[PDB]
Design a protein around this nucleic acid. Structure first.
Length: 66
DNA sequence: TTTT
């Protein structure tokens, strides 16, 4: 058992020939408070690809650093 | 090529 919900779309970074997009979103996993999520997504966003989840703290650390 |  596992669930996901894209709560907010922040940025699309690129799209490939199959229409999958790399995105920065706020995503809730298993109904938890949403985290930052940098991940590939199928065209209708019904299939997840490879990516990483970052807490607000981890994301701000990254932003401050670059 | 693709699932926390």
């Amino acid at each position: 058992e596992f669930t996901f919900e894209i709560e907010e779309h922040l940025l699309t970074l690129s799209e490939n020939e199959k229409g999958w997009t790399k995105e920065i979103n706020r995503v809730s996993f298993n109904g938890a408070p949403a985290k930052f999520d940098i991940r590939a997504w199928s065209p209708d966003h019904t299939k997840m690809g490879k990516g990483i989840t970052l807490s607000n703290e981890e994301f701000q650390t990254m932003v401050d650093a670059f």
